[PDB]
Paper text:
Among the neuronal KCNQ channels, KCNQ2 and KCNQ3 form homo- and hetero-tetrameric channels and are responsible for the M-current, which contributes to the stability of the membrane potential. Each KCNQ2 subunit contains six transmembrane segments (S1–S6): S1–S4 form the voltage-sensing domain (VSD) and the S5–S6 constitute the pore domain (PD). The C-terminal domain (CTD), which contains three helices, namely HA, HB, and HC, interacts with the calcium-modulated protein calmodulin (CaM). Here we report cryo-electron microscopy (cryo-EM) structures of human KCNQ2-CaM in complex with three activators, namely the antiepileptic drug cannabidiol (CBD), the lipid phosphatidylinositol 4,5-bisphosphate (PIP2), and HN37 (pynegabine), an antiepileptic drug in the clinical trial, in an either closed or open conformation.
To reveal the activation mechanism of HN37 on KCNQ2, we then determined the HN37-bound KCNQ2 structure (KCNQ2-CaMHN37) at 2.5 Å resolution. In KCNQ2-CaMHN37, to our surprise, there are also two HN37 molecules bound in each KCNQ2 subunit. One HN37 molecule (HN37A) binds in the same pocket with RTG and CBDA. HN37A mainly forms hydrophobic interactions with residues Leu299, Ile300 and Phe304 in S6I, Trp236 and Phe240 in S5II, Phe305, Pro308 and Leu312 in S6II, and Phe104 in S1III. In addition, HN37A forms two hydrogen bonds with residues Trp236 and Leu299, as well as the π-π interaction with the Trp236 side chain. The other HN37 molecule (HN37B) is located at the interface between VSD and PD and switched by S1III/S4III and S5II. HN37B also mainly forms hydrophobic interactions with surrounding residues such as Val233, Trp236, and Tyr237 in S5II, Phe100 in S1III, and Met208 and Met211 in S4III. KCNQ2-CaMHN37 is also in decoupled conformation, with activated VSDs and a closed gate. Although the two HN37 molecules induce a 1–2 Å shift of the VSD, the activation gate remains unchanged, with the shortest diagonal atom-to-atom distance of 4–6 Å at the activation gate. For the HN37B-specific interacting residues, mutation on Met211 attenuated the left-shift of the G–V curve but did not change the current amplitude; in contrast, mutation on Phe100 did not alter HN37 sensitivity in either current amplitude or voltage activation. These data suggest that HN37A is more potent than HN37B in the activation of KCNQ2.
Author numbering:
A (entry chain A), B (entry chain B), C (entry chain C), D (entry chain D): 70 to 184, 195 to 330
Amino acid sequence: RNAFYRKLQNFLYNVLERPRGWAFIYHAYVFLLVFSCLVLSVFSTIKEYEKSSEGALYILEIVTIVVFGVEYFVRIWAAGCCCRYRGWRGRLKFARKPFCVIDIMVLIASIAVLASALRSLRFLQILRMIRMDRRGGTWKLLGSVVYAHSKELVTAWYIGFLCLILASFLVYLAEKGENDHFDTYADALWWGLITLTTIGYGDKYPQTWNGRLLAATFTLIGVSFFALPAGILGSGFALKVQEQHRQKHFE
Amino acid sequence: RNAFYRKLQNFLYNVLERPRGWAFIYHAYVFLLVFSCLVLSVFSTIKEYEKSSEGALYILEIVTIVVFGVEYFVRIWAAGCCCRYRGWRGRLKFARKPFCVIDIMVLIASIAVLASALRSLRFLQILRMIRMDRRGGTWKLLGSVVYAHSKELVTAWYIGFLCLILASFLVYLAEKGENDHFDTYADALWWGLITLTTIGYGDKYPQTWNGRLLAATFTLIGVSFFALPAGILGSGFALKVQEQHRQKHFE
Amino acid sequence: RNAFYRKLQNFLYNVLERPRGWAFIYHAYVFLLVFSCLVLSVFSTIKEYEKSSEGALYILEIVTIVVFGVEYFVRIWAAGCCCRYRGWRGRLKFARKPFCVIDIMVLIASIAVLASALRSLRFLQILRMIRMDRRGGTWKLLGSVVYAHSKELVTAWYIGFLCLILASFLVYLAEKGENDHFDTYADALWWGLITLTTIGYGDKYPQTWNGRLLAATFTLIGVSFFALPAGILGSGFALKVQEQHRQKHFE
Amino acid sequence: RNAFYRKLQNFLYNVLERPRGWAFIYHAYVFLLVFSCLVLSVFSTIKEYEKSSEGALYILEIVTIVVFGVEYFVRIWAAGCCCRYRGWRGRLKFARKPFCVIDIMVLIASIAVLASALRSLRFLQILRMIRMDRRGGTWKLLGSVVYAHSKELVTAWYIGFLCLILASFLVYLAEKGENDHFDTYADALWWGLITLTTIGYGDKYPQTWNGRLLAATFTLIGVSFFALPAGILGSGFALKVQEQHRQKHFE
Ligand SMILES: C#CCN(Cc1ccc(F)cc1)c1cc(C)c(NC(=O)OC)c(C)c1
Ligand SMILES: C#CCN(Cc1ccc(F)cc1)c1cc(C)c(NC(=O)OC)c(C)c1
Ligand SMILES: C#CCN(Cc1ccc(F)cc1)c1cc(C)c(NC(=O)OC)c(C)c1
Ligand SMILES: C#CCN(Cc1ccc(F)cc1)c1cc(C)c(NC(=O)OC)c(C)c1
Ligand SMILES: C#CCN(Cc1ccc(F)cc1)c1cc(C)c(NC(=O)OC)c(C)c1
Ligand SMILES: C#CCN(Cc1ccc(F)cc1)c1cc(C)c(NC(=O)OC)c(C)c1
Ligand SMILES: C#CCN(Cc1ccc(F)cc1)c1cc(C)c(NC(=O)OC)c(C)c1
Ligand SMILES: C#CCN(Cc1ccc(F)cc1)c1cc(C)c(NC(=O)OC)c(C)c1
């Protein structure tokens, strides 16, 4: 009874460790559970709906603690699949990795919390969401694509900042006394930031003909130069996928 | 008198079934008719304009029922073009497909409705709009492009969610008591969602210097990381078109 | 004295007709003049600043009429450069083209107007702006790129429309009586259109927990599926430039 | 003691002049210092927080003056690294370049200012931010990419302007008397500009059924044709990076 043993250990370590396919289904389900916990906590932040929120949240938190403990133990057991971590010493030295210790300390802290502390619960929940990666692949990919396109990101940032400063100063000059919205340069800078991002709250906006005339040009330039970085990064990601796919199809 | 018979049957089945060219003109016209029906229903949802809207909608609904019935019958007849569905048995077994039964049940239901029920009319109208595809090609193309770029979509979603949570929490801390807009963490989360998408209703916005200072950075990051997915998918679609066009030109 | 004659005629026809380089400077200057005329008319639409607006606009309109007449006559004269239009008969038959007759009728109409009619001035000014192309190249390029990417434009439009309808209906159901903003389905549709485009006026927005909860998902999907078409078309234009540049460098 | 001399001079000139790698760390730190100075000035523009703002700003301005003077002198000394600028005459003729004279005059002016003048401080601070490039590389790259994609930028601008004019005029006609927001054509143009950019202040918006019906189409077209330029430029930048990277990898 060792062929089935090794088969199961291999498959379980592969699914729980770096997955590639349908193994993501389990990760999606556990993510959905933790997300439901987070949403219930957010609902518990209110007074009207506090009752039902805590009623569900208590049992859901117990369930997620049970699930996380079981997952951690099965991961520790299946760690013997890799040729490096073998035996008692191998599994003992496996735990020294940052993420395993993070997991064990996290479940210890949350079990202590559950057994005015909701702030700690929020912190631990967002930290668990941070833990979802477990390998920093997202950060590495983002850093690679950002470094590849550093020159254009820098030029876009430079020109956008210059346009923001110029537009804010000109509008502040043109509407110093005729509009109470722009009473200090800080207010004009806030207006420029909120308009060149196209958020447009509406709390501030030019009213004199000078301000509207100057905006009709400077906002037209600034909106594009503020949307540029997202387009650059999206095209970078798409081109990287294209090149990777063609290269992998070659070999 | 069978060469013309087969010619007409072939051409009509090709036009009514998968079209490639000017056949889309008829589809566009029928879509325009159903869209006019939908708009008239929306106008009939109001009390001031109920009279004229209903007066037009009755006859337009009758016309569209007639058109859909004629189209269904001619499609059933022309189904004999394909080598698979032939004869009485072939045409009888043709109707078992999901979309043909959907069409027949749909026109039956709408004719029954026309012969406080406007909710059913709305449901059936949006269902007809769903039926416009008839092959799920849109869904398949979207799924293919999404699967191809899954890694970058995931990284963008992860970083955007983290930025949203961090910004909302920091602003909520900075404006707990000095601004009545942010009285619960749910309100801060709503503000963050509405600002990082650049919708910017204006119902909530920071007013203290802390909130504005923290936004000036976190919204700058979050707006880009929330615009990223659309750019990624658009570039994916464009690159897919380029590769498909070059490949088809090769052969 | 015929080498200089032909040299000047060739150069002037090339600059005035399809330009390629610094010839665009003259076009830019004339565009700036007509744009100034338009802006002065817009200022004349107001009562406070009517005086100075008309004072400048009268002389500017006279100047632009003079310039347009001179340009039309010199174009007619230089039309003899092309091997097709030659001599009296050639130049007479040249005028039959749609744009030349448009220009002559336009300057006739504007000279008649200048010699409560400001509406006609606005119409003729926007028409002159339309005339700026003179070849429909913009429309042809747009049509080509749109036709190339028709399938993805259609899928994006389909999914975006479905998302808009679903989100609007769900929010209307969730906020029929608890929010006076959503009192008819037309209002909910207007809100959905204004939110999925990220315009976000703020005149309408959900207030109940149901509406906010449903928006937190449906707007996240819809904003991306509404931004998709612009990204698709921009990537199409960029890829077309890349391919054209490489092809021209090949030959 | 001349091998170390030349080694240090070479390394310092390379780091202070065109950098390529970790040399950017020093530039980032000096940028952070000047940015802190700017933010403190902006805070000093207010009356409530003037005290602490000026208290920090005085010493920070002294520190930045010291740093800039030291940097200028060390740059002048290290200029001897280049084979062109050598000796007393070489270093003397080095200063004639626009940026060196700009820097020396700038530090002279700021030292004079520090030894109701805050407007001059703002001007000199934004000018120092302008000086951050020192080579105009950002402007050259932007100009190159803009020139490469000139045709599509022009077509997008043309169609977007036409759509803006048409939509504004139609909405103004449809809401001349029933909505006080649109009382002059200038107001309608302002509304169109603020809506087609998706800024959406909310100060103006259609209320009659005509205006909403016409917007539901014209804004849908205009939003895409106004977002087009940023997407075009972003894709251009990404494709330029791809081609440059492949070409450099070739050689
Ligand atoms: C102003 C501006 C942009 N920034 C700074 C910046 C970057 C990203 C941000 F998110 C915020 C601020 C910037 C601009 C330039 C030209 C350079 N180049 C340089 O100094 O080399 C001599 C550098 C090193 C930084
Ligand atoms: C254009 C413009 C403004 N800037 C530059 C800037 C910022 C702060 C300064 F103090 C000075 C210059 C800018 C713009 C965006 C969209 C982002 N976010 C982003 O790129 O996400 C990927 C950032 C990080 C900076
Ligand atoms: C937080 C976040 C994003 N999401 C979830 C998500 C995705 C799309 C949505 F639209 C909404 C939520 C996410 C993030 C990561 C790193 C992973 N990777 C992983 O767990 O493998 C170990 C997965 C499987 C999902
Ligand atoms: C960035 C960001 C936020 N997220 C990720 C997210 C969402 C919910 C969570 F609970 C957790 C993480 C996000 C953003 C967009 C634009 C979309 N829509 C889309 O991509 O359409 C193609 C989706 C589906 C998710
Ligand atoms: C709903 C939706 C989109 N539209 C219509 C549309 C297009 C552009 C607009 F700007 C507005 C409306 C649409 C959708 C599909 C699936 C098809 N395909 C089809 O019928 O072939 C069988 C067609 C022909 C049109
Ligand atoms: C997604 C979405 C909505 N739709 C589709 C749609 C429109 C009307 C219907 F009645 C039905 C379906 C849509 C979206 C945009 C941005 C545009 N404009 C554009 O693409 O400019 C290039 C158009 C022309 C249609
Ligand atoms: C209207 C419009 C766009 N513009 C002007 C413009 C450009 C950029 C701006 F930011 C602002 C205004 C424009 C349009 C066309 C067709 C041409 N072509 C031409 O005249 O050749 C005969 C030119 C030379 C300029
Ligand atoms: C589409 C549209 C409007 N236009 C064209 C236009 C402008 C003024 C006119 F008077 C006439 C035509 C437009 C749009 C944008 C985003 C920008 N900014 C930009 O591209 O940054 C890179 C500019 C410079 C012009």
